Write an enzyme that holds these catalytic residues in place. Structure first.
Site, PDB file in Angstrom:
ATOM      1  N   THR A   1      28.009 -19.813  22.401  1.00 44.63           N
ATOM      2  CA  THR A   1      27.929 -21.267  22.499  1.00 44.63           C
ATOM      3  C   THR A   1      27.423 -21.703  23.862  1.00 44.63           C
ATOM      4  O   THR A   1      26.811 -22.769  23.989  1.00 44.63           O
ATOM      5  CB  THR A   1      29.299 -21.885  22.255  1.00 44.63           C
ATOM      6  OG1 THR A   1      30.180 -21.489  23.311  1.00 44.63           O
ATOM      7  CG2 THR A   1      29.871 -21.399  20.944  1.00 44.63           C
ATOM      8  N   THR A   2      27.689 -20.898  24.888  1.00 48.49           N
ATOM      9  CA  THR A   2      27.069 -21.100  26.188  1.00 48.49           C
ATOM     10  C   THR A   2      25.563 -20.869  26.104  1.00 48.49           C
ATOM     11  O   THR A   2      24.782 -21.532  26.794  1.00 48.49           O
ATOM     12  CB  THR A   2      27.722 -20.156  27.202  1.00 48.49           C
ATOM     13  OG1 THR A   2      29.142 -20.335  27.165  1.00 48.49           O
ATOM     14  CG2 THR A   2      27.249 -20.441  28.614  1.00 48.49           C
TER      15      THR A   2
ATOM     16  N   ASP B   1      32.390 -21.250  30.734  1.00 49.57           N
ATOM     17  CA  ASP B   1      32.362 -21.415  29.287  1.00 49.57           C
ATOM     18  C   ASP B   1      31.968 -22.834  28.906  1.00 49.57           C
ATOM     19  O   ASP B   1      32.655 -23.796  29.253  1.00 49.57           O
ATOM     20  CB  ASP B   1      33.733 -21.077  28.700  1.00 49.57           C
ATOM     21  CG  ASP B   1      34.073 -19.607  28.827  1.00 49.57           C
ATOM     22  OD1 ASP B   1      33.140 -18.778  28.832  1.00 49.57           O
ATOM     23  OD2 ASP B   1      35.275 -19.279  28.923  1.00 49.57           O
TER      24      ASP B   1
ATOM     25  N   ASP C   1      37.676 -11.729  22.617  1.00 49.90           N
ATOM     26  CA  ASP C   1      36.232 -11.539  22.682  1.00 49.90           C
ATOM     27  C   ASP C   1      35.828 -10.219  22.042  1.00 49.90           C
ATOM     28  O   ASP C   1      34.700 -10.071  21.557  1.00 49.90           O
ATOM     29  CB  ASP C   1      35.766 -11.592  24.135  1.00 49.90           C
ATOM     30  CG  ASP C   1      35.976 -12.953  24.760  1.00 49.90           C
ATOM     31  OD1 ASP C   1      35.955 -13.958  24.019  1.00 49.90           O
ATOM     32  OD2 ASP C   1      36.168 -13.017  25.992  1.00 49.90           O
TER      33      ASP C   1
END
Lengths: 509, 521
Positions: free
Chosen positions: A80-81, A47, A378
């Protein structure tokens, strides 16, 4: 004092070397990044948010990479990764061929037209999903719980998460745009077990009220939310000094309860048995209610009482001197405080302004609670994008190679100077189709070739690369899916970063 | 020191000029600015960023004073005055390296500066009304970044420019002047953006009332309330008497009937439409309908303080007298032409038509997105800066970059018949004039040397005029820079902006050439 191509190349070398190890962190099959602390501490994550906050960055462009990751995190938290992966090869491929020719503004407008062509191509490739079917919502959550590869009881938490977010779909901006997850609330329980729980109506509270201070159980009487003025009168109708004297005790206390009993008579008009009070709450005010046969509650934060107001769909009154059933406690309402473990947990069901249901989880420990929660964390990201856009885009390289071709015929049609950033972005899209071939372990030159060949026939509609089996697979058959909305904003963030550092030619003090 | 400090003056200011050349115009770029150990700002409009940055040299220090001297006075030409003076520093240095006194060049620099502003005097136009400032439709069109706002690029720009330009609107608390202040234009979406229309009067989003209160009032007296309602609090002060415990409930409901008297006294001074910033209950709407009044509750304070300054006399949005709900004494009333309820965005909102004490105008914009609200903000900031340059500078100058090439033509003849060393000083002052088309094409990612050679190639004689673009100089573009007519896509400029920046550039340049010491204990 810094200027020229050296800032531009330093923007390239920084943004590239960030995305190098993190694209190996991509995929449900991935490669962990190792971080050695100078104290010898070890970090083994994928992450990027834990990665970018931990690493030491000295280039402020690399600090800006965190900022656009903070942008994607605060809006979604996921992808965001992935936003930093796409932004690298946009400025890696196009720039040095064209900033030796030095046209910054043209590549900006080329980055403009790379965005909207991707938008129409999203509508080309995404078939709509059912927001009225759990099983249409189920496989996409199953695509997300296998990213961390936890399906101990996350598989039953799939249905818990979708029956929360689909229920709490209510959010207005003049045209009812719903992207909310704060209206949902998870239950954080050490006792019980996950599977014999289910979603309950209203918005369930675990944050402050963990005790039966409301009642034991409630069938008929309503909930009362009080931000109204409950500060008592010291004088006749005046605010004198409070009781600190026997002479101040005899005169003032007759008018202290007198302000409260007028409010209490206004509340008994709707017949509650539970009143919670947040602003203006006094110690005498919440215990004349004990004499008025209503157990009264304070010491709760404001975000609880936004949820509690959404647990019943009522407006928190600022009028102290008249309260109604159409003001607080819309409809009949239900309040259930039962024993789960050793603590008595307040549930507030029967939400008028209907469709409000939240998450009830309970691990056999808090650790057993917390591991299933992250998968449901998630999962509630995904269904919120389903509420945001009810169309599902195929995962893998099916979405990427389809858009990577449409820029090329756009480059052949427009055929100005901007045609050269289109093919550069077309190769910048393929890096996630590239990095899955290392995330599986196959020959990358053959699989990228055949994925172009499947665009010649099948147009890569659902046949993208898998980093799990290393072959170009039907995303319909394998169930690798995601909403269009999380794909767009991931791409939209990478467009924003590439335009940003293209403006950066000087870094001065 | 000596030449070396005069070198250090040039080398410092050239680096500063390189920052603001990469930030000029809308095609300028944003620059990273270290100001703290962990704070880096990224902006343009380079006079603003020099205030963000810190100075390094006294050469760097004196010019941050100069751009702020431009920036306090006006917002235009602020980053431009930095670039011009640094061009003077390289031009004069070669002459000082050649043979020339530093005293001699700055004379012909200021003499041409006197000559250039006399070109600005003969290059004036006061007719900027139907011509507009920057080609009426193009006053917003280069500033409307054409995403979903260039499709109404002539539709919106015909509307938003004519609504502000020379037509009526009141300034702060009723000052006699055409619109130089921010207006009551609102941004809200719904059904289309082609339905965005001009309205005569005021745009107000508000919560209307409905229990039989009047829906439309012509010749209304406006009460702009700053103070809320939905009860006034009292537990003792009326009805002290006690006969029953029922009478104790009769005590504390006398807070109702005392408001009934004060509403009619608000109605007595002057009132037809009640606009309350706070909320009004339907039980508290009952105070107004039995007196006879139009009470609209939950009025936005932002639009209401634009109305309270417009409505005339002493108003409750300016009063601090409070009794829970205060009562009027003498001459508290606001004015209006009429109050007509309208169906706009398919939302029944109170559309306040013009106030007495300087009748007004505004626009209700319609969109399809919240993004439509965002883009029309900067499509409101652009026209307000256009119109403000018109109303205080009626006499403007056609061309802002078209003038730079022709001023170089205007000075070479002024150099030629001058005589001595001053001739070469007039010419190198004209060499500083050429940087303005040069920094734009690089910012517009085009060729600078090609574009400025196009400009001088369009000529009959040395005068910028809107006659023609193929055989006279006229206009420019902020994204192209090709010389264009100043009604289609060319450019204007207020006369006040250039005469300050040309004066400030030689003002910096004279003191720099004085510097021949680095003495220090």
């Amino acid at each position: 004092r810094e200027s020229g191509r050296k800032v531009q190349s330093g923007n390239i070398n920084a943004a590239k070397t960030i995305a190098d190890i993190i694209r190996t962190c991509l995929g449900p099959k991935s490669m962990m990044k190792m971080l050695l602390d100078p104290m010898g501490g070890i970090v083994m994550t994928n992450d990027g948010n834990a990665i970018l906050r931990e690493i030491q960055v000295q280039h402020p462009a690399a600090k800006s990479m965190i900022e656009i990751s903070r942008t994607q995190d605060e809006e979604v938290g996921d992808g965001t990764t992935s936003v930093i992966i796409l932004a690298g090869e946009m400025l890696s491929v196009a720039e040095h061929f064209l900033e030796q020719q030095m046209h910054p503004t043209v590549v900006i407008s080329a980055y403009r037209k790379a965005l909207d062509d991707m938008i129409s191509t999203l509508k080309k490739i995404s078939i709509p999903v059912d927001i009225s079917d759990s099983d249409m919502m189920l496989n996409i959550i199953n695509s997300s719980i296998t990213t961390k590869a936890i399906s101990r009881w996350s598989s039953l938490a799939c249905n818990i998460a979708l029956d929360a977010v689909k229920m709490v779909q209510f959010e207005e901006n003049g045209r009812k745009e719903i992207d909310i997850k704060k209206y949902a609330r998870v239950e954080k329980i050490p006792g019980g077990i996950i599977e014999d729980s289910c979603v309950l109506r209203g918005v369930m509270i675990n944050k402050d009220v963990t005790h039966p201070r409301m009642r034991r159980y409630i069938k008929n009487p309503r909930i009362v939310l009080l931000d109204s003025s409950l500060e008592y009168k010291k004088g006749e109708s005046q605010t004198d000094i409070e009781i600190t004297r026997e002479e101040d005790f005899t005169r003032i206390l007759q008018m202290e309860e007198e302000y409260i009993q007028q409010l209490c008579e206004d509340i008994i008009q709707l017949k509650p048995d539970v009143v919670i009070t947040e602003k203006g709450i006094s110690d005498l005010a919440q215990h004349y209610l004990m004499r008025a046969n209503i157990t009264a509650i304070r010491r709760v934060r404001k975000t609880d009482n936004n949820r509690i107001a959404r647990a019943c769909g009522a407006r928190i009154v600022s009028r102290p001197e008249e309260l109604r059933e159409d003001d607080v406690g819309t409809g009949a309402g239900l309040l259930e405080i039962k024993k789960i473990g050793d603590e008595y947990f307040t549930f507030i069901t029967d939400c008028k302004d209907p469709k409000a249901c939240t998450i009830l989880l309970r691990g056999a420990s808090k650790e057993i609670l917390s591991e299933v929660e992250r998968n449901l964390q998630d999962a509630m990201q995904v269904c919120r994008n389903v509420l945001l856009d009810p169309q599902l885009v195929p995962g893998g390289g099916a979405s990427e190679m389809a858009v990577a071709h449409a820029l090329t015929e756009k480059s052949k049609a427009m055929t100005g100077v901007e045609q050269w950033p289109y093919r550069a972005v077309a190769q910048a899209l393929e890096v996630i189709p590239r990095t899955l071939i290392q995330n599986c372990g196959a020959s990358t030159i053959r699989l990228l070739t055949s994925l172009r060949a499947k665009h010649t026939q099948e147009n890569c509609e659902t046949w993208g690369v898998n980093g799990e089996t290393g072959t170009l697979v039907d995303m319909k058959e394998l169930g690798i899916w995601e909403p269009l909305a999380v794909k767009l904003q991931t791409y939209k963030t990478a467009v924003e970063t590439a335009v940003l550092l293209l403006r950066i030619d000087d870094i001065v003090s | 020191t000596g030449e070396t400090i005069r070198s250090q003056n040039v080398m410092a200011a050239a680096s500063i000029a390189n920052i603001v050349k990469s930030s000029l115009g809308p095609v300028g770029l944003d620059k990273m600015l270290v100001d703290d150990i962990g704070d880096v700002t990224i902006t343009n409009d380079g006079a603003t960023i020099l205030k963000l940055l810190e100075v390094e040299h006294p050469a760097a220090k004196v010019l941050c004073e100069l751009a702020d001297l431009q920036d306090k006075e006006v917002g235009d030409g602020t980053t431009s005055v930095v670039i011009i003076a640094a061009e003077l520093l390289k031009n004069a240095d070669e002459l000082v390296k050649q043979k020339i006194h530093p005293t001699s060049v700055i004379s012909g620099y200021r003499l041409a500066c006197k000559e250039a502003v006399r070109y600005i005097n003969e290059n004036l136009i006061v007719n900027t009304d139907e011509l507009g400032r920057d080609c009426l439709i193009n006053a917003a069109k280069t500033s409307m970044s054409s995403k979903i706002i260039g499709i109404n690029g002539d539709f919106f720009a015909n509307m938003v420019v004519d609504a502000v330009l020379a037509i009526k609107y009141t300034d702060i608390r009723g000052q006699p002047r055409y619109p130089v202040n921010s207006v009551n234009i609102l941004k809200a979406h719904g059904r289309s953006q082609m339905e965005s229309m001009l309205i005569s009067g005021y745009a107000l989003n508000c919560v209307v009332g409905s229990q039989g209160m009047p829906k439309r009032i012509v010749n209304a007296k406006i009460a702009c309330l700053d103070f809320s309602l939905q009860k006034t609090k009292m537990k003792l002060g009326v009805q002290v008497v006690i006969t029953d415990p029922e009478k104790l409930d009769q005590i504390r409901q006398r807070e109702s009937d005392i408001t009934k008297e004060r509403i009619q006294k608000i109605l007595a001074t002057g009132a037809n439409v009640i606009l309350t910033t706070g909320g009004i209950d339907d039980m508290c709407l009952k105070y107004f309908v039995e007196a006879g009044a139009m009470a609209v509750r939950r009025v936005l304070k932002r639009d209401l303080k634009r109305i309270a300054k417009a409505s005339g006399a002493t108003i409750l949005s300016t009063l601090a007298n409070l009794e829970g709900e205060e009562t009027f004494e003498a001459a508290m009333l606001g004015q209006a032409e009429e109050v007509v309820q309208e169906r706009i965005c398919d939302d029944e909102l109170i559309l306040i038509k013009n106030t007495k004490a300087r009748t007004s105008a505004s626009i209700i914009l319609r969109g399809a997105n919240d993004f439509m609200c965002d883009e029309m903000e900067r499509s409101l900031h652009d026209a307000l800066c256009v119109v403000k340059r018109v109303l205080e500078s009626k006499s403007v100058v056609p061309g802002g970059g078209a003038v730079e090439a022709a001023l170089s033509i205007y000075l070479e003849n002024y150099a030629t018949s001058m005589g001595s060393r001053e001739q070469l000083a007039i010419a190198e002052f004209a060499r500083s004039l050429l940087v303005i088309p040069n920094t734009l094409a690089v910012n517009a990612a085009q060729d600078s040397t090609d574009l400025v050679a196009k400009l001088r190639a369009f000529h009959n004689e040395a005068q910028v005029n809107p006659e023609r673009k193929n055989l006279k100089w006229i206009g420019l573009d902020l994204s192209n820079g090709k010389p264009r007519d100043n009604k289609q896509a060319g450019v204007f400029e207020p006369t006040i902006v250039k005469v300050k920046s040309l004066k400030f550039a030689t003002e910096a340049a004279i003191t720099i050439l004085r510097i021949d010491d680095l003495i220090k204990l």
